[PDB]
Every structure is written in C-alpha cells, then in structure tokens.
Design a protein around this ligand. Structure first.
Ligand SMILES: [Zn+2]
Ligand SMILES: [Zn+2]
Ligand SMILES: [Zn+2]
Ligand SMILES: [Zn+2]
Ligand SMILES: [Zn+2]
Ligand SMILES: [Zn+2]
Lengths: 52, 8, 52, 8
C-alpha cells in the first residue's frame, strides 16, 4: 500500500533494490541506504562515499 | 549503474 | 543482511517504519518515502511538503 | 513525531 507521499517508494513491497559501485570498490549497496532512486541507479553511474 | 533486485 | 553502506537501514527487514504529519493534514507517511531516519522521526516534529 | 511500525 502506498503512503501519503506523492512519490511513495513502497518500502512495503516484496523486493529490495540494489546498486553496485563503479568507483572501484565494486561493492553492492541497497538503493535506499545510499539515497538513490531506481531512475538514478539505472541512468547514470554510482560512486559510493568511500570511492568518491 | 549495475543494479539487481532480491526478495522482500 | 546489511549492505556495504556504513549506515545500512536494512530495507530487507520485516518491519516498515512510519511517521505522521504534525503540520495539519494528520496523514501517515512511510519514513523512507519522506527521507527521515528513525532518529529524526522520534526526536522532532514532522511537517510534510504539502503542509510546509 | 508520532511513529509506528507495521509488518514487512
Ligand atoms: Zn504498502
Ligand atoms: Zn510510501
Ligand atoms: Zn565504492
Ligand atoms: Zn539484508
Ligand atoms: Zn543497506
Ligand atoms: Zn501534512
């Protein structure tokens, strides 16, 4: 179920989205933990704070 | 970037 | 399981956190959808974008 | 603020 937010990300869904760093560590991050939207995660590269 | 989805 | 993030919020957990607006609409929001941490949600008031 | 937790 969606919440009152205009852009509800449905944290209640049965799927967890991930994104991998391109900066060099090559590690996997939960998208919500690093504050990226599925759009961001797919349309551009991702550089974690340790590789930044 | 490289992405993936897992369960729940 | 935790991801590579230093502060993993475990979106994989079996619980969903919510926060209610104090601005007037009195509506409920999923904390991740509005970008608030459990700490923020508990230690101060919450005013949604529509009530701001 | 007022908070709550629900399942999964
Ligand atoms: Zn829901
Ligand atoms: Zn939501
Ligand atoms: Zn990295
Ligand atoms: Zn996990
Ligand atoms: Zn995480
Ligand atoms: Zn409000």
């Amino acid at each position: 179920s969606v919440c009152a937010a205009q852009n509800c990300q449905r944290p209640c869904k049965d799927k967890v989205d991930w994104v991998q760093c391109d900066g060099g560590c090559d590690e996997w991050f939960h998208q919500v933990c690093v504050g990226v939207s599925p759009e961001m995660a797919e349309n551009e590269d991702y550089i974690c704070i340790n590789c930044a | 970037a490289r992405t993936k989805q897992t369960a729940r």
